């Protein structure tokens, strides 16, 4: 499937209530992303380190989805990572990052890591995804 189809579908999903319903929508976007992230690892990857797993997300995983690597990886060495993409493809605001938060969480989950993943537009079209690794 040509890349245009995913880009159009994602855009159509994000555009189509009250704060509760809106919240439910975000959660649905993230959850769909989670399932897709899992299935991508399942197909792609048949990792002696957490740092290795994060490197893979930034390299192979981001390339599989967005055809480029993450621009910056930062850590506090206490379980938080920040992944920076200087030109997030699904932008060219918060709504547009939710599915990708799930992609990351689902990809990590299939590699044995539980995480909470959130994101912000740092400065359009740059975005930062925060990955908080969970002990359980």
């Amino acid at each position: 499937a040509d890349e245009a189809l995913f880009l159009l579908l994602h855009n159509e999903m994000v555009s189509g209530q009250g704060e509760v319903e809106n919240g439910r929508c975000i959660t649905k976007l993230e959850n769909m992303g989670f399932r897709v992230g899992q299935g991508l690892i399942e197909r792609f990857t048949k990792f002696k380190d957490e740092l290795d797993i994060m490197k893979f997300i930034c390299k192979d995983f981001w390339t599989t989805v967005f055809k480029k690597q993450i621009d910056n990886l930062r850590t506090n060495h206490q379980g938080i990572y920040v992944l920076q993409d200087n030109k997030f493809r699904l932008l060219t605001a918060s709504k547009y990052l939710a599915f990708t938060c799930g992609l990351i969480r689902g990809g990590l989950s299939n590699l044995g890591i539980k995480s909470i993943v959130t994101a912000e537009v740092s400065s359009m079209p740059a975005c930062k995804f925060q990955v908080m690794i969970q002990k359980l």
Binding site: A1, D2, N11
Partner: protein
């Protein structure tokens, strides 16, 4: 692309949770497809030099041989032309967007790839053709082939 296939499968799964009945799922899939197709046509026309199709027969060829190839990497065969040239079928060897269905069946009325029918209608509306697209066979429904039947209704 697994990416598109997996994303579309997740969508269908979520819609089925949202809606009590599959007819509402079908309607929503079609709507989303229509909206996608409206955008897809501008992508398609910018990427190919198809000329312009001066009938439904030439349009069929463009859809089957060029557009499906570009977006899905597949070439459906065109069959079953009405004598009046306003109806034809796209035949596929499986379901183009969905690989598997869950057993036991809880979604007999679900048209798994109904989004594709919306895409087709929406993209053709933008070239001034009112059409109808409809699955009349589906391998996922136990048919020998998958068949999308295309009808030309009016010029816009």
């Amino acid at each position: 692309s697994e990416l598109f296939t997996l994303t579309y499968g997740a969508l269908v799964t979520q819609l089925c949770k949202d809606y009590e009945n599959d007819e509402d799922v079908n309607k929503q899939l079609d709507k989303m497809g229509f909206n996608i197709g409206v955008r897809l046509i501008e992508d398609f026309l910018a990427r190919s030099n198809v000329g312009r199709a001066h009938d439904f027969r030439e349009t069929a060829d463009v859809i089957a041989k060029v557009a499906f190839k570009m977006y899905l990497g597949i070439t459906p065969s065109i069959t079953n032309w009405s004598p009046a040239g306003d109806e034809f079928s796209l035949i596929l060897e499986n379901n183009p967007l969905v690989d598997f269905v869950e057993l036991p069946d809880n979604h007999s009325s679900l048209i798994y790839s109904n989004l594709l029918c919306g895409v087709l209608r929406g993209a053709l509306e933008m070239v001034q053709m009112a059409v109808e697209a409809k699955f009349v066979q589906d391998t996922l429904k136990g048919d020998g082939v998958t068949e999308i039947r295309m009808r030309f209704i009016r010029r816009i």
